[PDB]
């Protein structure tokens, strides 16, 4: 499992990370299409003997949500990378015609549309 907290890793809150947490993630987490992505893929339970050989970095929305809650990221680009990894993992392991690939593509389109309204200049927030 991927780590969601690390005192040795620089992390903080920015205006963009706060937007991804309170606006973007809040909308994607409740979306109908998000259910296959809300927790890690369990290769043992699902019978995927080659999943962890094909997928080098598993990622799911629950891990991203916990990283946002724990101020794990330093910049919004790190959170964008985790989303990109989650979507691309599905594109790699599954066939282009599989329904789950279209579910990921649709969620990715929503994600990118919501990110378009993100604050364009990243600024660290320290007031609590």
């Amino acid at each position: 499992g991927s780590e969601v907290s690390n005192p040795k890793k620089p992390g903080r809150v920015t205006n963009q990370l706060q937007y991804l947490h309170k606006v973007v993630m809040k909308a994607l987490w409740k979306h109908q299409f998000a259910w296959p992505f809300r927790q890690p893929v369990d290769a043992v339970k699902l019978g995927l003997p080659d999943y962890h050989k094909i997928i080098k970095q598993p990622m799911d929305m629950g891990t991203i949500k916990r990283r946002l809650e724990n101020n794990y990221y330093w910049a919004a680009s790190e959170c964008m990378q985790d989303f990109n990894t989650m979507f691309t993992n599905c594109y790699i392991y599954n066939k282009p015609t599989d329904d789950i690939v279209l579910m990921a593509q649709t969620l990715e389109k929503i994600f990118l549309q919501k990110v378009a309204s993100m604050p364009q200049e990243e600024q660290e927030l320290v007031v609590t």
Binding site: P36, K45, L46, G47, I100
Partner: peptide, 12 residues
């Protein structure tokens, strides 16, 4: 019926 059942039928 469950999440695991539907996840299984979807990914396969």
């Amino acid at each position: 019926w469950s999440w695991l059942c539907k996840k299984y039928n979807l990914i396969h």
